[PDB]
């Protein structure tokens, strides 16, 4: 078992990149995107559809839009006289380069994500969201600026991880902005406690937050931030009493009321 070591092994089974290979792959991806848009202009079809069919042909039969239409469009692309099959070639090469770049940079995602444990998401969920951010960064990277890929990719990986944490960490979903409000309130209260030598009051937290903040608003914000408890929480030393055994039902009418 232990899927973390399994994934780490699969990750380390791919060699890292040097500057030459990384810049070569990024350039190949950029030229592939340019070739894709040129091909779309030549054939008159949508860039998205042509990108999808080219990616399907690159990934092959292993990855399961249907074979009929993709084969039709792939043959229509083979109908180009010359100087356009070249664009098709650069498109395919750029897609292969995109795949290779993502695979090679998968380790930075793990290195970043190992610092966000213990915040309501498991390690592998954090890794997968970081992978999504990495794919975004590969999509948006620009090698002309002579910047190392990790420099640009770290921002997108962090954005993906934080958005995932704010979106999927609570049983009751809270909007992103108000999650940031809760986190800011917690940080403010913690620093106030550190300075005061005791737990602050709602008035002091309101004053420290700034304008537009009073004790009632702080109370409401702390009220909504409560997480639900488990109906299966054990009660007592023995494993025979749970929490939900003490909670009556108020919806269904009682026999007295029905009579």
């Amino acid at each position: 078992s232990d899927p973390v070591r399994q994934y780490l092994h699969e990750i380390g089974q791919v060699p890292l990149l040097t500057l030459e290979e990384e810049v070569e792959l990024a350039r190949k991806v950029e030229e592939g995107m340019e070739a894709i848009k040129k091909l779309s202009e030549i054939t008159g079809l949508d860039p998205d559809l042509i990108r999808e069919v080219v990616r399907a042909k690159i990934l092959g039969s292993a990855r399961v839009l249907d074979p009929k239409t993709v084969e039709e469009i792939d043959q229509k692309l083979k109908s180009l006289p010359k100087e356009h099959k070249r664009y098709l070639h650069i498109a395919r090469e750029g897609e292969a380069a995109r795949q290779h770049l993502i695979e090679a940079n998968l380790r930075l995602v793990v290195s970043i994500a190992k610092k966000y444990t213990g915040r309501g998401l498991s390690f592998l969920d954090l890794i997968q969201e970081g992978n999504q951010g990495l794919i975004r960064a590969v999509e948006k990277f620009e090698y002309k600026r002579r910047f190392k890929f990790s420099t640009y990719a770290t921002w997108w990986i962090r954005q993906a991880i934080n958005r995932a944490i704010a979106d999927q960490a609570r049983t009751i979903r809270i909007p992103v902005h108000m999650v940031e409000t809760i986190n800011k309130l917690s940080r403010t209260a913690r620093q106030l406690q550190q300075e005061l030598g005791r737990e602050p009051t709602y008035e002091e937290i309101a004053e420290a937050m700034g304008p537009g903040w009073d004790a009632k608003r702080v109370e409401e914000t702390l009220k909504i931030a409560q997480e639900p408890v488990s109906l299966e929480t054990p009660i007592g030393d023995e494993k025979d009493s749970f929490y939900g055994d003490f909670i009556p039902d108020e919806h269904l009418p009682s026999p007295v009321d029905a009579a």
């Binding site: 003490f246 269904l252 026999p255 029905a258």
Partner: protein, 96 residues
């Protein structure tokens, strides 16, 4: 519990004692009209305060909970009659 105005537990061994006595109707009353036959317990209370005798019991709610939870494990549990045709215990409230 007394703090929750609760009832006493009629556990497995009490059911065994009732079975050993051959008290079939008493045991069925404990299982349905007094625990979780909702329609049954409502009708029993109404009949007792009206002066009549308690009516016949129905399926306990706990069996319906069991059926629904077995369905959640992707198991098809069906109640059939003497001709192996399905009988609906949910009163048509769970069929599209």
């Amino acid at each position: 519990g007394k703090a929750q105005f609760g009832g006493q537990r009629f556990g497995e061994m009490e059911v065994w004692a009732l079975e050993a006595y051959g008290a079939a109707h008493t045991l069925q009353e404990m299982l349905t009209l007094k625990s979780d036959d909702i329609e049954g317990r409502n009708a029993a209370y109404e009949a007792i305060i009206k002066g009549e005798d308690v009516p016949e019991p129905s399926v306990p709610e706990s069996f319906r909970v069991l059926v629904k939870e077995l369905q959640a494990l992707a198991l098809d549990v069906q109640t059939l009659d003497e001709k192996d045709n399905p009988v609906d215990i949910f009163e048509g409230l769970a069929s599209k």
